[PDB]
Amino acid sequence: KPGAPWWKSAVFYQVYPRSFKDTNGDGIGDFKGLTEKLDYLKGLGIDAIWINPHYASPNTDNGYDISDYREVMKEYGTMEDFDRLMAELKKRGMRLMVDVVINHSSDQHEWFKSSRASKDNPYRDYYFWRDGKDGHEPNNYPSFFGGSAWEKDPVTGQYYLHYFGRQQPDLNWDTPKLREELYAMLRFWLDKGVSGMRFDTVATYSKTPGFPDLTPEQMKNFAEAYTQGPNLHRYLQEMHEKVFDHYDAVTAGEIFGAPLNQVPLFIDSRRKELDMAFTFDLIRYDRALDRWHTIPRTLADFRQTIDKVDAIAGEYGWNTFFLGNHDNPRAVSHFGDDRPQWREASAKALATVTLTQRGTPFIFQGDELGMTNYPFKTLQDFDDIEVKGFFQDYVETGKATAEELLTNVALTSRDNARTPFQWDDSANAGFTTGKPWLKVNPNYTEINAAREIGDPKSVYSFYRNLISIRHETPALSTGSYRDIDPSNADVYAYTRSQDGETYLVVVNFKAEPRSFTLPDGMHIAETLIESSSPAAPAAGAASLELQPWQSGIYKVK
Numbered sequence: 175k176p177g178a179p180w181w182k183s184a185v186f187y188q189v190y191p192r193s194f195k196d197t198n199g200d201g202i203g204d205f206k207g208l209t210e211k212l213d214y215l216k217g218l219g220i221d222a223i224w225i226n227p228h229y230a231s232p233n234t235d236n237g238y239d240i241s242d243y244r245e246v247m248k249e250y251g252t253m254e255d256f257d258r259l260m261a262e263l264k265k266r267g268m269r270l271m272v273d274v275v276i277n278h279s280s281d282q283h284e285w286f287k288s289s290r291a292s293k294d295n296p297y298r299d300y301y302f303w304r305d306g307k308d309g310h311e312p313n314n315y316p317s318f319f320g321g322s323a324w325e326k327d328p329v330t331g332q333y334y335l336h337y338f339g340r341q342q343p344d345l346n347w348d349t350p351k352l353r354e355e356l357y358a359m360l361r362f363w364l365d366k367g368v369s370g371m372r373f374d375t376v377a378t379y380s381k382t383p384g385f386p387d388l389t390p391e392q393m394k395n396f397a398e399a400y401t402q403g404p405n406l407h408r409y410l411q412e413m414h415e416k417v418f419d420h421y422d423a424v425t426a427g428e429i430f431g432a433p434l435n436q437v438p439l440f441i442d443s444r445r446k447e448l449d450m451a452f453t454f455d456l457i458r459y460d461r462a463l464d465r466w467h468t469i470p471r472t473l474a475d476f477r478q479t480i481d482k483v484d485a486i487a488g489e490y491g492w493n494t495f496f497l498g499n500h501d502n503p504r505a506v507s508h509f510g511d512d513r514p515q516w517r518e519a520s521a522k523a524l525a526t527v528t529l530t531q532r533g534t535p536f537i538f539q540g541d542e543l544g545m546t547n548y549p550f551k552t553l554q555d556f557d558d559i560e561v562k563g564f565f566q567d568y569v570e571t572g573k574a575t576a577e578e579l580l581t582n583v584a585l586t587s588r589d590n591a592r593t594p595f596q597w598d599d600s601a602n603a604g605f606t607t608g609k610p611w612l613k614v615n616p617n618y619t620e621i622n623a624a625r626e627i628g629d630p631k632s633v634y635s636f637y638r639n640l641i642s643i644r645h646e647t648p649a650l651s652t653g654s655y656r657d658i659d660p661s662n663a664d665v666y667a668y669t670r671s672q673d674g675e676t677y678l679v680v681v682n683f684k685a686e687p688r689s690f691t692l693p694d695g696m697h698i699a700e701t702l703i704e705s706s707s708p709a710a711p712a713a714g715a716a717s718l719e720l721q722p723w724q725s726g727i728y729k730v731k
């Protein structure tokens with residue numbers, strides 16, 4: 175029949191350029207570093223890479239505050255280096271997905287420098303400027319990065335809106351001329367051959383008319399209210415009509431803060447908005463509302479959340495799947511057990527899950543090596559502007575002590591994912607010849623690409639084999655998904671099926687032996703791969719005995 179888009183069967187790798195590979199000793203990764211490592215990614219089996227922002231930026235949010243959408247970030251290289259990265263990817267049959275940050279720009283962008291000059295400036299309405307009320311801000315909106323989402327500018331006496339940092343003013347999508355500027359910007363990169371675009375905080379583009387105060391209830395989860403602008407889908411549909419309908423690039427949205435029942439509006443292919451969804455339900459399934467505390471959860475919660483997310487894709491939508499990214503703690507530390515004796519086994523188990531979920535998997539740089547959270551010792555060990563925001567909102571206000579913030583944010587911080595990639599065991603793990611912008615994890619002596627690649631029993635080798643198996647088994651990418659028992663908090667088991675072929679995935683999430691009884695009528699036919707198992711089951715088995723953290727993929731009958 176008709177086939178599926180290349181993107182539904184692709185395995186993506188996310189590169190955070192700043193921490194991938196430095197080639198000039200300034201301690202910051204760059205395009206030349208990434209280009210020199212394309213053979214490494216191709217050898218691992220990667221089809222496409224998504225890079226974080228690579229545009230001109232003051233870096234108050236490491237690329238997410240853009241001052242010029244048509245120039246490359248100085249730290250990464252030049253437009254020539256970007257062009258070379260593209261060409262080398264193409265020589266290897268690989269595709270590039272870039273990050274698109276158009277909910278807001280840097281306050282250094284020329285549009286903002288113009289906007290702030292006067293109320294009658296032609297660019298005034300490229301942003302949101304409003305009078306304060308009752309001697310304070312326009313309304314009670316809080317910022318994700320600390321304090322109020324409203325900043326007064328004495329040049330005009332009004333306040334501008336910023337959901338994120340003070341140096342990331344929100345762009346005004348209710349203004350036609352600004353929407354047209356953004357479309358022309360997207361075409362600039364698409365005309366260069368870019369194959370995909372990831373839309374940063376795509377659900378917050380539409381603002382609420384009149385900016386009334388959030389109710390006390392809404393305030394509890396302000397992220398959600400910010401995703402309820404009345405014109406959101408109208409704007410996304412217009413972006414598709416004027417830009418994406420004219421190219422063959424895949425689009426994916428970072429649907430931050432929106433309730434899961436609204437995700438189909440963004441990804442149902444019939445609506446002509448986005449192709450794939452990046453949801454937060456699973457990766458933040460154990461995160462408190464303040465985003466810096468954790469809440470104990472079990473595998474039952476994990477799988478039940480995945481069931482809900484899969485159901486939302488319905489028949490016309492499509493999900494991405496990921497256990498890690500640049501805004502969350504390290505996969506093995508977060509969902510696995512990173513203790514020395516369990517790190518490799520649990521990282522392999524999580525690899526099995528990642529590569530057998532229904533959706534397009536994104537492997538975050540370093541997770542294929544089993545990289546872990548970083549041992550922060552003081553609040554100064556964090557670079558992340560979000561941690562400074564928590565200090566402002568919780569420590570300076572007396573709600574928590576600096577020690578309490580350190581203790582808790584150490585387990586949830588985005589910086590856990592941003593320590594430099596561990597290439598080998600030379601100075602700073604071969605990431606740089608200079609001083610890394612963020613400290614390298616001392617565990618690079620045990621966790622590094624050179625050692626991983628030379629060992630058939632490594633986490634890396636396991637990911638590589640899982641990727642080969644997935645590429646050879648259509649059911650593992652586009653097949654249906656059925657969780658055999660959503661209530662089981664010990665062993666995660668599900669089937670993937672397509673065209674009469676069914677595969678069974680069984681993953682022990684406990685560090686103790688466990689048993690698993692197959693569904694009535696189901697029996698093992700073959701064993702494709704297992705991790706931490708002393709032996710594959712016998713053909714015909716109606717049950718399995720699992721070692722701690724063991725994972726396996728089996729073709730059933």
Ligand SMILES: [Ca+2]
Pocket residue numbers: 196197198199200201202203204249
């Ligand atoms: Ca560099």
